[PDB]
Write an enzyme that holds these catalytic residues in place. Sequence first.
Site, mmCIF file in Angstrom:
data_model
loop_
_atom_site.group_PDB
_atom_site.id
_atom_site.type_symbol
_atom_site.label_atom_id
_atom_site.label_comp_id
_atom_site.label_asym_id
_atom_site.label_seq_id
_atom_site.Cartn_x
_atom_site.Cartn_y
_atom_site.Cartn_z
ATOM 1 N N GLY A 118 -37.636 5.757 31.911
ATOM 2 C CA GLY A 118 -36.260 5.835 32.909
ATOM 3 C C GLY A 118 -37.754 5.925 34.234
ATOM 4 N N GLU A 139 -47.031 31.854 21.872
ATOM 5 C CA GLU A 139 -47.799 31.700 20.565
ATOM 6 C C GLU A 139 -47.625 29.725 20.177
ATOM 7 O OE1 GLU A 139 -44.918 33.898 18.607
ATOM 8 O OE2 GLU A 139 -46.014 35.628 19.621
ATOM 9 N N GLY A 145 -32.828 13.066 35.635
ATOM 10 C CA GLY A 145 -32.459 11.803 34.993
ATOM 11 C C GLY A 145 -30.961 11.925 34.178
ATOM 12 N N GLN A 146 -30.846 10.853 33.927
ATOM 13 C CA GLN A 146 -29.330 11.177 33.616
ATOM 14 C C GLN A 146 -29.786 11.575 31.788
ATOM 15 O OE1 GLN A 146 -26.109 7.429 32.251
ATOM 16 N NE2 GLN A 146 -27.708 6.553 33.060
ATOM 17 N N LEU A 154 -42.973 30.946 23.912
ATOM 18 C CA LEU A 154 -43.478 29.382 23.803
ATOM 19 C C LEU A 154 -45.380 29.621 24.164
ATOM 20 C CD1 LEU A 154 -41.544 28.862 27.424
ATOM 21 C CD2 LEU A 154 -41.134 28.394 24.552
ATOM 22 N N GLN A 166 -28.606 14.505 30.684
ATOM 23 C CA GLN A 166 -28.173 14.414 29.718
ATOM 24 C C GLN A 166 -27.687 15.520 28.582
ATOM 25 O OE1 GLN A 166 -26.016 10.714 27.830
ATOM 26 N NE2 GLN A 166 -27.591 9.662 30.370
ATOM 27 N N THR A 174 -35.849 8.396 37.618
ATOM 28 C CA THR A 174 -35.638 9.987 38.384
ATOM 29 C C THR A 174 -36.530 10.953 37.221
ATOM 30 O OG1 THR A 174 -33.741 10.099 39.164
ATOM 31 C CG2 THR A 174 -34.344 12.192 39.150
HETATM 32 N N1 LIG Z 1 -31.075 11.047 23.591
HETATM 33 C C1 LIG Z 1 -30.928 10.270 24.358
HETATM 34 N N2 LIG Z 1 -30.946 9.389 25.053
HETATM 35 C C2 LIG Z 1 -30.816 8.856 26.361
HETATM 36 C C3 LIG Z 1 -30.002 9.580 26.579
HETATM 37 N N3 LIG Z 1 -29.365 8.989 27.999
HETATM 38 C C4 LIG Z 1 -30.669 7.769 28.123
HETATM 39 N N4 LIG Z 1 -31.452 7.789 27.096
HETATM 40 C C5 LIG Z 1 -32.112 6.719 27.228
HETATM 41 O O1 LIG Z 1 -33.753 7.478 28.361
HETATM 42 C C6 LIG Z 1 -34.005 6.411 28.448
HETATM 43 C C7 LIG Z 1 -34.580 7.006 30.100
HETATM 44 O O2 LIG Z 1 -33.731 7.841 30.583
HETATM 45 P P1 LIG Z 1 -32.272 7.502 31.302
HETATM 46 O O3 LIG Z 1 -31.347 8.184 31.654
HETATM 47 O O4 LIG Z 1 -32.483 5.598 31.894
HETATM 48 O O5 LIG Z 1 -33.749 7.167 33.552
HETATM 49 P P2 LIG Z 1 -33.239 7.923 34.392
HETATM 50 O O6 LIG Z 1 -33.407 8.974 35.344
HETATM 51 O O7 LIG Z 1 -32.123 7.972 34.620
HETATM 52 O O8 LIG Z 1 -33.200 6.456 34.904
HETATM 53 P P3 LIG Z 1 -33.135 6.285 36.468
HETATM 54 O O9 LIG Z 1 -31.105 6.735 36.426
HETATM 55 O O10 LIG Z 1 -33.316 5.305 36.979
HETATM 56 O O11 LIG Z 1 -33.043 7.312 37.414
HETATM 57 C C8 LIG Z 1 -32.820 5.819 28.838
HETATM 58 O O12 LIG Z 1 -33.525 4.135 29.308
HETATM 59 C C9 LIG Z 1 -32.678 5.900 27.664
HETATM 60 O O13 LIG Z 1 -33.262 4.572 26.941
HETATM 61 C C10 LIG Z 1 -29.359 10.651 26.495
HETATM 62 O O14 LIG Z 1 -28.093 11.435 26.876
HETATM 63 N N5 LIG Z 1 -29.608 10.984 25.390
#
Ligand SMILES: Nc1nc2c(ncn2[C@@H]2O[C@H](COP(=O)(O)OP(=O)(O)OP(=O)(O)O)[C@@H](O)[C@H]2O)c(=O)[nH]1
Lengths: 426, 412
Positions: B116, B227, B9-10, B225, B14, B118
Amino acid sequence: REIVHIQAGQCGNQIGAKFWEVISDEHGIDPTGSYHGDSDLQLERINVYYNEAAGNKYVPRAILVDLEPGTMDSVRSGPFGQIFRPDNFVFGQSGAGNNWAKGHYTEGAELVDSVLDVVRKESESCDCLQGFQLTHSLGGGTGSGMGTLLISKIREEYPDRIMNTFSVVPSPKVSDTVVEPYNATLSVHQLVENTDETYCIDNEALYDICFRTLKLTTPTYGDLNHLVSATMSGVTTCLRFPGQLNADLRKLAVNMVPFPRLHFFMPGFAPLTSRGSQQYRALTVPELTQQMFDAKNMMAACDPRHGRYLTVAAVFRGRMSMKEVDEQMLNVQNKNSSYFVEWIPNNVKTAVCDIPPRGLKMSATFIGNSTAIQELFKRISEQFTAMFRRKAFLHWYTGEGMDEMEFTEAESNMNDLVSEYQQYQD
Amino acid sequence: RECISIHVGQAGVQIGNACWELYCLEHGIQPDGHVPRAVFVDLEPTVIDEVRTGTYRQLFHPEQLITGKEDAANNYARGHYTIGKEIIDLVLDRIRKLADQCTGLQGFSVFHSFGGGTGSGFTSLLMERLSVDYGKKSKLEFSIYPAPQVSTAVVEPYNSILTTHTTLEHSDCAFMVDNEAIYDICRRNLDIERPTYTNLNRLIGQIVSSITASLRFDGALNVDLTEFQTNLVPYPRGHFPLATYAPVISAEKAYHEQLSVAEITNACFEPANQMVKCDPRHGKYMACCLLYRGDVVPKDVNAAIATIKTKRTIQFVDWCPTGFKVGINYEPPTVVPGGDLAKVQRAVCMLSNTTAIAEAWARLDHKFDLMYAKRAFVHWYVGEGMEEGEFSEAREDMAALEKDYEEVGVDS
Ligand SMILES: Nc1nc2c(ncn2[C@@H]2O[C@H](COP(=O)(O)OP(=O)(O)OP(=O)(O)O)[C@@H](O)[C@H]2O)c(=O)[nH]1
Ligand SMILES: C/C(=C\c1csc(C)n1)[C@@H]1C[C@@H]2O[C@@H]2CCC[C@H](C)[C@H](O)[C@@H](C)C(=O)C(C)(C)[C@@H](O)CC(=O)O1
Ligand SMILES: Nc1nc2c(ncn2[C@@H]2O[C@H](COP(=O)(O)OP(=O)(O)O)[C@@H](O)[C@H]2O)c(=O)[nH]1
């Protein structure tokens, strides 16, 4: 993923001609030429709106339908007009009228089986298509029942894909038609249950928002069908760029439509500015999140301040702090908790693309799903009951093979739509 | 001896692209100078694509970068059942491929993010497919817990509740990490009101480039891990600690780093640097895991605690006499050359397990009620193949993680 546009009718061919005159420029794409894009990014996700034939030459993946050549020729024999392949046009030399029954029956039909044939030739383009973009008006003819006959036949072949629509609901003050309410009720009758997202647009608001948010003195349609285009732009396409938390019609409908009703929206732009007069525009996020939710600057004449909010979904775009976005979308959610519904602990569905509007820094497309669209869905309905108890222009529909029950149907169909909307504004 | 990393997921792709960015960083080996050891997956291109099209793009084999051309869409039930499956077995494959490719591995690091698509539902049937194909290993995952207010998606809770429950009974330890909690540190302990996501994930790679990387290094009392969970998770529940850090300093607001071992250690237990907005509003740590790395001495550490402790208003569980599995590496942090982390000689990573998350769990659950109490976005799931039960259960489930994360503690 790919989306497919279907500008239906003069209006839609007019709104579209201006939509494709925005989603085009935003991609540096001359009349028929090519990716003379300022950016090298304005061309990787274009597979959302364009197609790849003569390589260098793209074809905006959209069809245009009608029943009175006098408008399509306007388009093609006009500016951007030439760029959509020929066949990409569908229409009839038939009596267009302002009869919904004619666009969805006696004539609108005998034109669909060739319009459907067209769309698939595009549906079978390539890769997983996201959905369809159908722009039109709910008070005329070749767009109302003619459109409705499409979105209600498109689902028949694409029950999976997402169903969109920027339907121009009859302005609250002055209709550019007579049988406004008729074509209306009868129209949504099909949308309310064939679409899963519908940005209602009011030809008046766009006036109020051009004469007061701007101070333009001769606001013609080119301006209007722009304005629309901005939002219509943002939502889709724009959202298909790299985003620090990107979205798309899927997640929008999945965040924007709580109950099955598909529910209709209200587009709002945030960085609207008064010609050369207003330089200013410190354009932060609070001044972008400032406009958006303002009791005006909203495309539909309905008053956001006249009903709760189910799931707002401000789409941001233009390098910015998430930290403030939340803050800003939080403080607007709190300092204003009055119109945000409690059965949805966190309405707002933030989305922050990266690249913004060309000569613009930060932008803020809006898409509120407020229970304030019950103010028009009532409007266009109260006008109906009127002209029905006197079976007014009923014979332009009947004569075109129809019923006195279908007018009962559509209305009652589109009527509870106000009911289920009152079922949350309270 | 090896730790597999999963990024979904993003968020996952990310947060991780930032932890996997400080990694090589503190391992002195530029863009293409050995080979990584993870695998990224999404069911919505562009994000994953935003990796394989920029920095680090070439530090991963396109095989690992599984990606789907479907529609992620923020609905759990779509990443798990409906579309996740469309690419999952393919991931299990990649993972195993990476599993067999080594000399006796260890566990996994599943970076993702509850609220979210994924990352929520998908990972869910990644871990299930993991934990029942590796019971003999460990399964750690960084639970980026849906902020307490500063949200995003409308469904946020739905996704989570279902995800946590369909994962709990699998992973062995979940490091909570809130988005706001961090924010509320990048304005207090860093003085910057322009904290981009690129920063919130750099602060993750700063609490991640430890738990492992560090640990896996030599020093005082190495901590694998194994531990961790063996000392961090009291009971079967995949109990989820809440990452922290003390040398959280504004690389331009605090012109002083020579802040001896003690002082930072005091910071950790302060309800401010907590990486999760789970202020110890009652919570009673059951087992901290202070991990010192760099210039930290085994007597200064064995002292800072003999007071952090006897500070009493530090309140430690009843049943746990000495809950302080210490760790002490030799190498200090290695701040991003141009970030905002003033960088320092010492540093903790305190990643405790306190009767604190007992909070967000509750709230992030009560949200679920209000919604589900009207079904709200429910159909957006059932259509994607689900039953009124899943939502039912993945709640009663939480009810327990409540009647447990408050039970075990609170009562002596
Ligand atoms: N700390 C942090 N939080 C993030 C980041 N990107 C997104 N989030 C938060 O995490 C939540 C869940 O992650 P998502 O990226 O939305 O989930 P996803 O898997 O992308 O969802 P889909 O795109 O529908 O598959 C998001 O709604 C944001 O509130 C990031 O880079 N860092
Ligand atoms: C002639 C213009 C618009 C227009 C007139 S008729 C039509 C179809 N479009 C100009 C220039 C075009 O707007 C593009 C570049 C400037 C964008 C800026 C972000 C701008 O500040 C924007 C918020 C505006 O002020 C409007 C486009 C809404 C308008 O008030 C100014 C204008 O006329 O733009
Ligand atoms: N915004 C906008 N509204 C228009 C435009 N042209 C017509 N309309 C609206 O659309 C209504 C008529 O719909 P129209 O599509 O022209 O009728 P049709 O050709 O028979 O389908 C009018 O009453 C107006 O409210 C246009 O270019 N822009």
